[PDB]
Amino acid sequence: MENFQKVEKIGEGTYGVVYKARNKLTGEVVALKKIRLPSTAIREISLLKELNHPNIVKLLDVIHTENKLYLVFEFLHQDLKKFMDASALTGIPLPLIKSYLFQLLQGLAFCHSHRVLHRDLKPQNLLINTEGAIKLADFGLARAFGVVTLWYRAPEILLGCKYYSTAVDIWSLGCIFAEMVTRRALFPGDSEIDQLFRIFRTLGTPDEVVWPGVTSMPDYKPSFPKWARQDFSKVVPPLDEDGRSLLSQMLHYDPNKRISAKAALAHPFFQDVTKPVPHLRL
Ligand SMILES: O=C1Nc2ccc3ncsc3c2/C1=C/Nc1ccc2c(c1)CS(=O)(=O)C2
Structure with missing residues (x-):
């Protein structure tokens, strides 16, 4: 050293x-x-x-x-948290949100193809440069080593699933996508139960119909309040139908139904993807 x-x-x-x-x-x-x-x-x-x-x-x-x-x-x-804060008055342009989301899915598809999970994706470990690139930091460290933000945690982790999959990273990136669009954190929980109930209040309390096996999960309680699901048109305005469709597949409750990074790259939302240059103040 x-x-x-x-x-x-x-x-x-x-x-x-x-x-x-x-x-x-x-x-x-x-x-x-x-x-x-x-x-x-x-x-x-x-x-x-x-x-x-x-x-x-x-x-x-x-x-x-x-x-x-x-x-x-x-x-x-710079990281994406600082860039989102610097862009808060005008919002990140949709072409740049789309470019960053497409690049992050490419990085995820690569790590997931090698059976490597991030497990803790958040704007502070998404790093950007002056060329328009965005990169994932700390893939594999969680598995390698064995106040923490809960805002991007997948519901199967919050419900005590010990053997979670690559789908946890798709959930976290879906939460980040929504935050770039609306300029507000999607689920800003400040405890594990507040995090869970914020997800439930928006996407509806999960049941056996939408998520087979959910009621047998370690931290699942039959006493959970039963909330109805909200429309995505209300959740992420003014995001177009392609973006909302893609986000809804990234936020499916059942990890097995949740879109993979590779399938997400083929979604119609990326039909007109480009690589713009952000204006960075360093
Ligand atoms: O370059 C880097 N590589 C790694 C690898 C792993 C890793 N883990 C946690 S951070 C990090 C970084 C990393 C952080 N960089 C950096 C540089 C400048 C500014 C920020 C971040 C926050 S800002 O935008 O307010 C000013």
Whole structure:
């Protein structure tokens, strides 16, 4: 770590603090993560170094020195949370929302094809550059290591499913899509039950008809209040029918019915996708 000069703190993640740093040898500007503290973890994190894609933040190096772990990542100058805040008065243009959603689905389709899940997608780990690219940061770390935001958590995780699938990432990205469009978080829960009941109040309390097996889930309670579903026209105005159709498939309750990233890329909403240039203030 004597090979790195810390510039400034750029994040306070779940696995540890993230710093902007300069590699004293190559002159490279990187994102340095010091993991807060196992052999199983080293092996799984070593596999992530090979999971390379243009929409995935590159894991450059794994440094296991003095019983401490450091992850060296590719550096990007802004995240989607800051960009959404900077664009709050005018909203992100629909062509740029569509481009970012299409690129994130490409990154998801790639990781999911390698049986790698993110599990904790949120605007703070979606990173953007001046070329119009958007990249996913921290794919696979949750599985590798084993106040936290609940806003993007899939309902099967909240209902105590221990063996959840790639569908959890589609749910999180659907919540992010809705937030880019409306300029407000879709389900801003501040406890696990508030998160669950916010989902229920919008999409309706799930039952055996819409989600076979839901009533046998570990944290399912028959005492859950029964709310009726709301129209998507009310949930994400002024999003057109193609966008609302795609979002509804990303937010299906049953993980098995929820659209895959690969099928989502073929949805008619992406018929006119382009790659615009965002205006970034750095
Ligand atoms: O470049 C990076 N790579 C990684 C890899 C993993 C990882 N985990 C959590 S963050 C992160 C980052 C990362 C953060 N970058 C960055 C740079 C500048 C600004 C922000 C973020 C927030 S802002 O938009 O308010 C100003």
